[PDB]
Amino acid sequence: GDGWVMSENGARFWGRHGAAGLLLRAPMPGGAAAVLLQHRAPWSHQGGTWALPGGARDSHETPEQAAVRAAHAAAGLPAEQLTVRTTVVTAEVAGIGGTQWTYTTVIADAAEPLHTVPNRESAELRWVLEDQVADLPLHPGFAASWQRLREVTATIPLLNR
């Protein structure tokens, strides 16, 4: 999204069209829901913490496309193996001069926990039971949103058939 947005409070944010991340859900044989998280490599933004695979939204892309593309880049996930459910704006910043920055969480489902090939800033990818996500050292942006995302996820159960 090649550039900065400057906030009203004077911090810069990367990506003119904001960013998007994939919250990908999968059922366990147990039957409970897991989510796929990315452990951020120390050399990347907020390295040492866990968050969603995501990146900057491009000019011609929907938030959904951006998050799915980011998940492919970070984890090798094929789009055909997942199903996008909805989007939630999890962060919104008043930029200087009318402009805006947002982060959009794109909730999606897979039929089972998928095999991943780590690349980019994927130090690790790990399927984490939904109830255990908040036990981890989370990216502070993600952690600020997590409870709200849970409330939303609980109103759309995973698909079948």
UniProtKB/TrEMBL annotation:
Its cofactor is Mg(2+). The keyword Cell wall biogenesis/degradation does not apply. This is Mutator protein MutT3 (MutT/nudix family). Belongs to the Nudix hydrolase family. The keyword Hydrolase applies. The gene is mutT3. It holds the Pfam family NUDIX. It comes from the Bacteria. Keywords: Hydrolase. It comes from Mycolicibacterium smegmatis (strain ATCC 700084 / mc(2)155) (Mycobacterium smegmatis). Residues 15-149 form the Nudix hydrolase domain. GO terms for molecular function: hydrolase activity. InterPro entries: Nudix_hydrolase, NUDIX_hydrolase-like_dom_sf, NUDIX_hydrolase_CS, NUDIX_hydrolase_dom. SUPFAM superfamilies: Nudix.
